[PDB]
Design an enzyme around this catalytic site. Structure first.
Site, PDB file in Angstrom:
ATOM      1  N   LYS A  44     -27.680   8.859  75.903  1.00 21.34           N
ATOM      2  CA  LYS A  44     -28.732   9.250  74.966  1.00 21.34           C
ATOM      3  C   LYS A  44     -30.087   9.047  75.657  1.00 21.34           C
ATOM      4  O   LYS A  44     -30.874   8.172  75.301  1.00 21.34           O
ATOM      5  CB  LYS A  44     -28.581   8.421  73.667  1.00 21.34           C
ATOM      6  CG  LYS A  44     -27.377   8.835  72.893  1.00 21.34           C
ATOM      7  CD  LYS A  44     -27.002   7.812  71.820  1.00 21.34           C
ATOM      8  CE  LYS A  44     -26.030   8.445  70.873  1.00 21.34           C
ATOM      9  NZ  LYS A  44     -25.622   7.459  69.774  1.00 21.34           N
ATOM     10  N   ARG A  65     -16.433  -1.127  64.842  1.00 22.02           N
ATOM     11  CA  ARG A  65     -17.458  -0.892  63.831  1.00 22.02           C
ATOM     12  C   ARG A  65     -16.866  -0.857  62.436  1.00 22.02           C
ATOM     13  O   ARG A  65     -17.563  -1.183  61.489  1.00 22.02           O
ATOM     14  CB  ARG A  65     -18.242   0.398  64.106  1.00 22.02           C
ATOM     15  CG  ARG A  65     -19.362   0.141  65.102  1.00 22.02           C
ATOM     16  CD  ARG A  65     -20.095   1.401  65.505  1.00 22.02           C
ATOM     17  NE  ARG A  65     -21.355   1.142  66.190  1.00 22.02           N
ATOM     18  CZ  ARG A  65     -22.121   2.072  66.766  1.00 22.02           C
ATOM     19  NH1 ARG A  65     -21.727   3.341  66.897  1.00 22.02           N
ATOM     20  NH2 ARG A  65     -23.288   1.721  67.285  1.00 22.02           N
ATOM     21  N   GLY A 121     -28.598   1.100  70.556  1.00 22.80           N
ATOM     22  CA  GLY A 121     -29.974   1.537  70.285  1.00 22.80           C
ATOM     23  C   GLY A 121     -30.673   0.684  69.253  1.00 22.80           C
ATOM     24  O   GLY A 121     -31.848   0.334  69.405  1.00 22.80           O
ATOM     25  N   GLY A 160     -21.683   1.443  70.335  1.00 16.65           N
ATOM     26  CA  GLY A 160     -20.345   1.926  69.991  1.00 16.65           C
ATOM     27  C   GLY A 160     -19.497   2.102  71.230  1.00 16.65           C
ATOM     28  O   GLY A 160     -18.337   1.664  71.263  1.00 16.65           O
TER      29      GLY A 160
END
Ligand SMILES: Nc1ncnc2c1ncn2[C@@H]1O[C@H](COP(=O)(O)OP(=O)(O)O)[C@@H](O)[C@H]1O
Ligand SMILES: [Cl-]
Ligand SMILES: [Mg+2]
Length: 405
Positions: free
Chosen positions: A204, A37, A385, A362
């Site tokens: 999540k 990232r 997401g 990630g």
């Protein structure tokens, strides 16, 4: 971004640039485990410096500290160090992201200064829950740190958070990573190859389950794995799930989601067996369980088992296009990595026979780094997401907030 200002058309000469990036990198034993990232933002940062930016002030979140300062656990300081090597230029780290001291450091920097602020989520005003006047004051502070604004935070673009939608400067431009990722997905989602399989896993769960309703209008098959499976299995199979991740809110819609999958002809593949752990620790004692046996009280399912891998492979074999966000177990710990490894092997094999394969997030992208498959799938995205939200068909908030042309 045809309708939005982008960095290629932003005059940065002599300007201070304040840039939202997604530097929410994975950490294990306090080290960065994947710089994907960070590396991904370098083209926009370099472009600003090369075209005469006075400064580039970088801002991001790290983890979910929930609006309290947690520099012991979620400081961005290690990222500042890593950014230096990747850029070929030094970077200065500030221990906050707003207000007097930060404002002074960003007001009139030496030419070519690169500055990384601390974790935005140390403040409740970023999310801002974890107060309207405080939210306003937070946004006002961030807005003082540059003359123009760039958003290159593709991985965070689904979040309507202060640094993403609330900066008030005349020009708010999309960066080159934002453009690259949106362009890839625009092409890949326009007329997907079918069957189109979504692989949903990870940790999540609450957020992920809320994406399923709209995703069921787009895909032909769905694997629901990783931490998400347990909520489904508890509700549908009355399965004992021990201390496994569970979403009380998402449980209330599981049957409706399965009804909608049936109505839309979407085949749902849930796991049928598990590797269990007596605690959430790399060196936990481990066991095995099936849906029929249940998971013992005080134990958690941290990977799928072999019979689940077989079912997941069957769905991958049927697929002509795949989007995957969320590992199917705790792949960072070897005891719980076999399911994710096996699925990666299937997805790489699929790519080799012409499947379009997209892996994002990630942590999920770190599976590609760990097993050396980054160039063996079609696309590895910095968004997970955020990518699922594009799959739903939405305009992402971080894009919507950019300046119109
Ligand atoms: N059964 C499980 N229980 C708890 N955590 C899990 C399980 N399966 C996968 N995970 C975790 O999910 C995390 C990644 O989920 P998430 O952050 O949603 O994905 P991404 O980073 O790609 O967006 C990983 O750190 C992994 O250890
Ligand atoms: Cl969540
Ligand atoms: Mg993650």
């Amino acid at each position: 971004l045809s309708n939005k200002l982008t960095l290629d058309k932003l005059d940065v000469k002599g300007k201070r640039v304040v840039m939202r990036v997604d530097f929410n990198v994975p950490m294990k034993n306090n080290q960065i485990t994947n710089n994907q990232r960070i590396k991904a933002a370098v083209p926009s940062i370099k472009f600003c410096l090369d075209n005469g930016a006075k400064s580039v002030v970088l801002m991001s979140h790290l983890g979910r500290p929930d609006g309290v300062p947690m520099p012991d656990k979620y400081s961005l300081e290690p990222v500042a160090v890593e950014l230096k090597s990747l850029l070929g230029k030094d970077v200065l780290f500030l221990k906050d992201c707003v207000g007097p001291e930060v404002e002074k450091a960003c007001a009139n920097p030496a030419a070519g200064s690169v500055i990384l602020l601390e974790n935005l989520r140390f403040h409740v005003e970023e999310e801002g829950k974890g107060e309207p006047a405080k939210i306003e004051a937070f946004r006002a502070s961030l807005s003082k740190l540059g003359d123009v604004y760039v958003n290159d935070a593709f991985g965070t673009a689904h979040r309507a958070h202060s640094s993403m939608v609330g900066v008030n400067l005349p020009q708010k431009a999309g960066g080159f990573l934002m453009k690259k990722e949106l362009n890839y997905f625009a092409k890949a989602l326009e007329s997907p190859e079918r069957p189109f399989l979504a692989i949903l896993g990870g940790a999540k769960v609450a957020d992920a389950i809320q994406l399923i309703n709209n995703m069921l209008d787009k895909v032909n098959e769905m694997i629901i794995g990783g931490g998400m499976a347990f909520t489904f299995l508890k509700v549908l199979n009355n399965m004992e799930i021990g201390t496994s991740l569970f979403d009380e809110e998402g449980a209330k819609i599981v049957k409706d989601l399965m009804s909608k999958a049936e109505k839309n002809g979407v085949k749902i593949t849930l796991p049928v067996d598990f590797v269990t752990a007596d605690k959430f620790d790399e060196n936990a004692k481990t066991g095995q369980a099936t849906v029929a046996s249940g998971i013992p009280a005080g134990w958690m399912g941290l990977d799928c088992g072999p019979e689940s891998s077989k079912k997941y492979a069957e769905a991958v074999t049927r697929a002509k296009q795949i989007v995957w966000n969320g590992p199917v177990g705790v792949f960072e710990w070897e005891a719980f990595a076999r399911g994710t490894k096996a699925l990666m092997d299937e997805v790489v094999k699929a790519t080799s026979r012409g499947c379009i394969t997209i892996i994002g997030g990630g942590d999920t992208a770190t599976c590609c780094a760990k097993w050396n498959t980054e160039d063996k799938v079609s696309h590895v995205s910095t968004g997970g997401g955020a990518s699922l939200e594009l799959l739903e068909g939405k305009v992402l908030p971080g894009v919507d907030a950019l300046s119109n042309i």
